[PDB]
Structure 1
Amino acid sequence: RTSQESANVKASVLLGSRGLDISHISQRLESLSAATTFEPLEPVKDTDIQGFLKNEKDNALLSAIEESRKRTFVMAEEYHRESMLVEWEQVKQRVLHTLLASGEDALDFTQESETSYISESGAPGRSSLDNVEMAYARQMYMYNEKVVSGHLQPSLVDLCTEAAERLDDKNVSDLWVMVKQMTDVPLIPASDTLKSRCSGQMQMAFVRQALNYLEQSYKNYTLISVFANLQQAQLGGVPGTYNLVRSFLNIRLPTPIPGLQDGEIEGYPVWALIYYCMRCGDLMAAQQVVNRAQHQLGDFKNCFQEYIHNKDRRLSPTTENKLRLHYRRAVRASTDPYKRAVYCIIGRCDVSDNHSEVADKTEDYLWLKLSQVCFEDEANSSPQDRLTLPQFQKQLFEDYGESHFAVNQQPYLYFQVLFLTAQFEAAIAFLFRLERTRCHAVHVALALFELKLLLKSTGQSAQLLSQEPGEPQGVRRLNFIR
């Protein structure tokens, strides 16, 4: 069914060959897509009515046979369904008879895998290490000098970061960028991550650092994109949140898809502007956008401005209840993903909005998830946002697996997910599984130990990873000494 478009494009070509602006032709092709061909008040077209009508008859007969065969397909698919019902009845009785007669219709089974442990070896003089490890040796040597001297020294994170860039290992330097950023958003030690996770205030503060972290990270990637397109973005490194926003719209979303709610300011999608304002975290730019778009929003503009001023990131509970009552009954779905997500988050209800963000923007997926995640796991009148976060996390990791967003073969993505979700132990054991990453995980875990973190397993001849009751189940306790 390649029809319709191929007809309408050349129809517009011919109509423009006779005159009149594109608005009337757009309306005409709209009506062409509307109902069948030929007007009840009759066309009413332009020159070449003869070719018009020849192709119109051809498409009309196309449409007639389409209607007929589609009705027949309706009945035939119902018969398909009933036929397959009977067919599976037959296949089930087939399976029953096979099992009763020692026959089979096919079966499969195997066994799983258990921990296997491997290591490396050293060498003196002509040694088994690398230039990488030698550069690291300089850093930890100078670091340990101040450690033993009792002096205060910069973070090992940075130390090994500037250790990194000189090899032109820019991805690892970036990995240190994430690590150091998450250190810089501060993390109160509790002498083991179990204490931090058990402390309800610490998890709230960690959520605060995580949201600040992801906002700044998106802003950084926005900066990287803008500078990479600096010619397209039309700046010389010129600062300014507003012109940055406008240039970034010029690049990513100059034109929206057909089917949007609310018009565009000078050609920028309003909801896109608002969303990018939240994602970069520029509250002043968000206020500028909402002040410019106050007319499209009405009192909802004032509501959003009050929400912005509310660092609780939510309005009064009574207002929330009334608005969620309105949304559940009337507003619900629409043709604006941004509007739907905004209503869902303000009501703190509904987890339907997922959209399409795989393999380079799953971080925006994560921002979506966390923003809807509420501060309590206890099921309120919106239980879809009141959930055991650790179970949620673990099913995202293992149960959701690693291939849906294709992190079953990407190191940084899934790892960083585990880290930001605070699974430092299994994340480090993860890094251990790639040969070139062990020293790196060593530096990272040493930084964690500096921050007074990490889990421990009892024993000296015990293996690396263990699980111990008393700590919530599923969090492997890594034998640090192992």
Structure 2
Amino acid sequence: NVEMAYARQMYMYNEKVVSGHLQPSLVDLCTEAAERLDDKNVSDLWVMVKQMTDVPLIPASDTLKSRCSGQMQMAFVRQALNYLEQSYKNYTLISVFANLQQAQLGGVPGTYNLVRSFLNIRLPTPIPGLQDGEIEGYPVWALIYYCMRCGDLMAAQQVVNRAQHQLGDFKNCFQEYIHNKDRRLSPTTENKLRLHYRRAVRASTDPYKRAVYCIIGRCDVSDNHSEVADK
């Protein structure tokens, strides 16, 4: 039944190609076939295929040169990050709606409040050794980390603006990171951030602080941050 569902999509695709019509996306036809099979793993697979294939198609004569281009490699990593961020935002949403009494979602929509309510589930007890204070009883670095993990850099910037007096120069680095299309610091700001990381942040007791600096500064690539990145 699965092979027949796809063979029908191949027929419909080829019929449109042969008739000289606008070539349908084979990804969309196969995603529509997968949604009819009621297999969640196959649906999640085609959502991933759709996200990773949404890249600027260059009519290159040579597929290898196109795929190995720095622009195309950067497009794939951007789509993989967007997929993982959306997946985690949906996981955060489902986890909060499954635990509404503990989560205390409140009445104000947005990723910032969703992450606060997720922290009531994931951090029910104060973890000793968190740094740079709390916003409304929630740890600053945990809020920044989970807003970034959900792909909502604007919700993370709201946290950074509220904690601006504790975070110092990090605010300016984080503002530069958000305004860059590639989520990149300038080589000067990045080297300043890496030097600050090695001197002070690497020895921090706060695992969320370490992870956020390692992400933005692209440093300590040997550390897996298993205290905050467990999956």
TM-score bracket relative to the smaller structure? 0.7 to 0.9
CA contact (8 A) 2:55 2:75 kept: no
Q: CA deviation at 1:323?
A: 4.4
CA contact (8 A) 1:185 1:213 kept: no
Q: CA deviation at 1:319?
A: 4.0
Taking every aligned residue pair, what percent have the same amino acid on both sides? 100
Counterparts of 1:157 and 1:230 in 2: how far apart (Å)?
Answer: 37
Change (3 A) 1:360 1:161: farther
The 3-state SS of whatever aligns with 2:203 is coil
Identify, as 1 or 2, the structure richer in helix. Answer: 2
Worse-matched range after superposition: 225-234 or 136-145? 225-234
Change (3 A) 1:311 1:232: same
CA contact (8 A) 1:344 1:350 kept: yes
Larger RCO, structures 1/2 (Cα 8 Å, 6+ apart):
2
Q: CA deviation at 1:271?
A: 0.8
TM-score, normalised by the number of residues in structure 1 = 0.42
Counterparts of 1:162 and 1:237 in 2: how far apart (Å)?
Answer: 35
Q: CA deviation at 1:286?
A: 1.3
Change (3 A) 1:324 1:360: closer
Counterparts of 2:228 and 2:202 in 1: how far apart (Å)?
Answer: 25
Q: CA deviation at 1:317?
A: 3.1
Q: CA deviation at 1:290?
A: 1.0
Counterparts of 2:71 and 2:62 in 1: how far apart (Å)?
Answer: 15
Counterparts of 2:14 and 2:215 in 1: how far apart (Å)?
Answer: 48
CA contact (8 A) 2:85 2:150 kept: yes
Unaligned runs of at least 5 residues, structure 1: 1-130, 362-482
Q: CA deviation at 1:179?
A: 1.0
Q: CA deviation at 1:177?
A: 1.4
CA contact (8 A) 2:190 2:217 kept: yes
Change (3 A) 1:226 1:187: farther
Counterparts of 2:48 and 2:29 in 1: how far apart (Å)?
Answer: 14
The 3-state SS of whatever aligns with 1:204 is helix
Change (3 A) 1:197 1:182: closer
Change (3 A) 1:155 1:222: farther
Change (3 A) 1:168 1:320: closer
Counterparts of 1:187 and 1:354 in 2: how far apart (Å)?
Answer: 34
CA contact (8 A) 2:173 2:189 kept: no
Counterparts of 1:311 and 1:219 in 2: how far apart (Å)?
Answer: 21
Q: Residue deviations 1:6-52, cap 9 Å, x none?
A: xxxxxxxxxxxxxxxxxxxxxxxxxxxxxxxxxxxxxxxxxxxxxxx
CA contact (8 A) 2:6 2:33 kept: yes
Q: Residue deviations 1:385-440, cap 9 Å, x none?
A: xxxxxxxxxxxxxxxxxxxxxxxxxxxxxxxxxxxxxxxxxxxxxxxxxxxxxxxx
Worse-matched range after superposition: 230-239 or 163-172? 230-239
Counterparts of 2:156 and 2:63 in 1: how far apart (Å)?
Answer: 36
Q: CA deviation at 1:360?
A: 7.5
The 3-state SS of whatever aligns with 2:119 is helix
Q: Residue deviations 1:74-97, cap 9 Å, x none?
A: xxxxxxxxxxxxxxxxxxxxxxxx
Change (3 A) 1:359 1:164: farther
Change (3 A) 1:330 1:154: same
The 3-state SS of whatever aligns with 1:332 is helix
Change (3 A) 1:335 1:153: same
CA contact (8 A) 2:145 2:212 kept: no
Q: CA deviation at 1:168?
A: 2.2
CA contact (8 A) 2:207 2:228 kept: no
Change (3 A) 1:355 1:191: same
Change (3 A) 1:148 1:231: farther
CA contact (8 A) 1:188 1:202 kept: no
Q: CA deviation at 1:195?
A: 1.8
Change (3 A) 1:152 1:220: farther
CA contact (8 A) 1:254 1:268 kept: no
Counterparts of 1:203 and 1:157 in 2: how far apart (Å)?
Answer: 20
Q: CA deviation at 1:320?
A: 3.7
Change (3 A) 1:178 1:215: same
CA contact (8 A) 2:144 2:160 kept: yes
The 3-state SS of whatever aligns with 1:226 is helix
Counterparts of 1:312 and 1:160 in 2: how far apart (Å)?
Answer: 30
Q: CA deviation at 1:172?
A: 0.9
Counterparts of 1:359 and 1:309 in 2: how far apart (Å)?
Answer: 26
Change (3 A) 1:159 1:226: farther
TM-score, normalised by the number of residues in structure 2 = 0.79
Q: CA deviation at 1:350?
A: 2.1
Change (3 A) 1:187 1:248: farther
User: What is the alpha-carbon root mean square deviation over aligned residues?
Assistant: 3.4
Q: CA deviation at 1:249?
A: 2.4
Counterparts of 2:57 and 2:99 in 1: how far apart (Å)?
Answer: 35
Unaligned runs of at least 5 residues, structure 2: none
Change (3 A) 1:211 1:139: same
Counterparts of 1:236 and 1:223 in 2: how far apart (Å)?
Answer: 13
Counting matched residue pairs gives: 231
